[PDB]
Amino acid sequence: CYGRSMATGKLVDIGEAVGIVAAQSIGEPGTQLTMRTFHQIVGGLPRVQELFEARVPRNKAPIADVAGRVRLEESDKFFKITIVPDDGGEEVVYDKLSKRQRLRVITHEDGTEGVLSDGDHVEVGDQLMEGAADPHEVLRVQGPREVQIHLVKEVQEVYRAQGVSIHDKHIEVIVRQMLRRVTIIDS
Amino acid sequence: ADVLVPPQKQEILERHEAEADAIERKYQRGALNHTERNESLVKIWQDATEEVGKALEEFYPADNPIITIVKSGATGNLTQTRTLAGMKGLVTNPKGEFIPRPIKSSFREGLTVLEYFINTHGARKGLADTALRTADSGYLTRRLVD
Amino acid sequence: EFVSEEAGREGTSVVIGPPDVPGTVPPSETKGLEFDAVLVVEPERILAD
Amino acid sequence: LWPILTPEDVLAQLYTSHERLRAAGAPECLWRADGEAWTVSDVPLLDEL
Amino acid sequence: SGRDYEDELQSERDYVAGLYARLDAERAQSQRRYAAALREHGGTAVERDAEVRALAKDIARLNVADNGLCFGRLDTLDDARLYIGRLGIFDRDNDFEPLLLDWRAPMARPFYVATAANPENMRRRRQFHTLGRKVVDFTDEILGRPTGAEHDATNDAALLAAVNAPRGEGMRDIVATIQAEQDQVIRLDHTGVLVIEGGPGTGKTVVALHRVAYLLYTYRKQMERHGVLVVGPTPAFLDHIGRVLPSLGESDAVFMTPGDFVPGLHVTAEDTPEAAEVKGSLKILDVLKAAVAD
């Protein structure tokens, strides 16, 4: 499941500590990322720490709970969105969306660049606003495996925007630990 | 002799100085804010820096040592070459804001006294904050290891 | 009749009267507004409350 | 002997009982059956409490 | 509602659409430069951080101005057209002719302080009512003796044009007297407590809102963070104010009826007049304290 060692170019040997190697690989280029303000949303290390700590994003964006069609009820300085599920279930409403964040841009084949509009088919776990989705929302909506995929995606996006070349497998080694435990409901 | 200066520099600088004078006229006319004047001047001088960079890159012979080291991928980058023989460009004040008036001199020509003084700010900022950058990186690495 | 006439007109209009009379609002409900046409019901009644 | 109070508690107990009404020095005009049936005159009293 | 008004509105809509096209072009350029600075900046870490932060501030500035970009237009006595908005927009191609003026610029000052009896060289002030990027409508105020032509959404222009009276024993312009009184109310220097009282039909509400706009522009440093509290007798009146309220800059207004004062509580019921009288007077404070002491 780990695959080959990047250093040797062959299947990783039994007993080799991939965890410490992944931690060092991620941390070593850390100084190349944009840092927090020392003058005392910019990306880089401040967001990486945000992703690995599973904190609620400051620039949070809501995500679609159900797949369906969007009915948009814009207000003077706020947005309201309703999703009519294609399954015929209960309509889902987001009610206090700000206009400081701009509405999601789609980039689908139906054009080259465009924003969410009435009648657009929105999938499960699809974001409605520009920003960052809350990983806990992804967990309750899309599930654990999709949360791990999302976390790896976001971290590697942050690194790619900064011109760093960490292989995804180290990020996956780290993220596997973030979702290693279950809370028990009934004994 | 190898540090070539592109002949187009002065024409570009005069054009952008005319643009800056136009903005000065508009500001003195009450049509523009102080902060917005700073914004516009910063953007114009960024355009000037890009123009001078292109002129320098097209003027240098392919086999000149200074451009040879950069283009060979041995070390350095075109930004350092533009700073060396083009113009230093805009520099930040202690608050991190760009100072609207750029350093039009290059290190080949040698900066004037005030250009050098305003240059020292970002230099000391970089010298001072490096330990904090290293500490943040080390902290993240430590948590990942743990 | 007033309601029907004010439909073809231009502007905004209202009927002011006691709550007991259908399709009317008390004067206090218009305390700060202005209208083009107003139809007032039973002045001798709303004047007494 | 000294309970923690909320404005609604104070006004409800004051309006609902004649004894607390007389103790506070208010007239019988203020008594009403339902304490927490607020009216536009109660809002500033609630704010002051 | 008429085809002429629709055509003028369409012209203004086209101009606003061009403004938004320029906005989007600038935002795209800024985003491209931001990505380039993140990925391939050859300077020191401090210089890269400074440039990236500058571009991020620029992008945020563009985003916050996306909604309601344009406030209105000023038509000068010399026919010059000035557009007032959330951002300044200039043509580098024509020596920076302002297509849009930042509302805080001195040249945009008349949009807030100008009056129909002491105009700042302006002929007309037009306000755009907008939702998102589209202009839902516009309203004209004429800084003189209007002829009742342009649509104002308040009918003051037509009603003033419909004035009728003889010259009188001493000749009086009549209209100019109304303009002078409304101006002397609006341009008052006293920033403390002001009381405006007039018989019905004098348009006291719009005059008061003009006074509020003048105050909030003149002293924007001292008030913009604190906002405005607009108190009205009924929710419908507060909707009316929301319709006619002029530009407040970056400031904001909170609308309340006297029954809405307590946060989280809404009240409409009225007491008997005797209970209302006793509860309204400050001598209730003696009762309340006693009620606590008991």
Coordinates of C-alpha atoms in Angstrom, one line a residue, chain A residues 32-38 41-43 74-77 99-100 102 161-163, chain E residues 27 34-35 38-39 48-49 52-53 56 62-64 66-67 86 130-133:
Chain A
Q32 CA 9.9 28.1 1.6
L33 CA 6.2 28.8 2.4
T34 CA 4.7 32.2 3.1
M35 CA 4.7 32.6 6.9
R36 CA 2.3 34.2 9.3
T37 CA 2.5 37.9 9.9
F38 CA 5.3 38.9 12.3
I41 CA -6.4 35.1 3.6
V42 CA -2.8 34.4 2.7
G43 CA -1.9 30.7 2.2
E74 CA -30.2 36.9 -3.1
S75 CA -30.8 39.8 -0.7
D76 CA -29.3 43.3 -0.5
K77 CA -26.0 42.3 1.2
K99 CA -21.5 38.8 0.1
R100 CA -17.9 39.5 1.3
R102 CA -17.9 35.7 -3.7
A161 CA 0.9 26.9 -5.2
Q162 CA 4.2 27.5 -3.5
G163 CA 6.4 25.5 -5.9
Chain E
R27 CA -9.3 41.3 -10.6
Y34 CA -0.7 36.8 -7.0
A35 CA -0.2 33.3 -8.3
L38 CA 3.6 32.8 -4.9
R39 CA 5.2 30.5 -7.4
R48 CA 7.8 38.0 -1.7
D49 CA 5.6 38.2 1.4
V52 CA 1.8 38.7 -2.0
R53 CA 0.2 40.6 0.8
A56 CA -4.1 39.8 -1.5
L62 CA -11.9 44.4 -5.4
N63 CA -14.2 41.7 -3.9
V64 CA -15.7 44.0 -1.2
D66 CA -18.3 44.0 -6.2
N67 CA -21.7 44.5 -4.6
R86 CA -17.1 52.2 -4.0
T130 CA -29.0 48.4 -7.0
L131 CA -29.1 44.7 -6.1
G132 CA -25.9 42.8 -6.7
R133 CA -24.5 44.0 -10.0

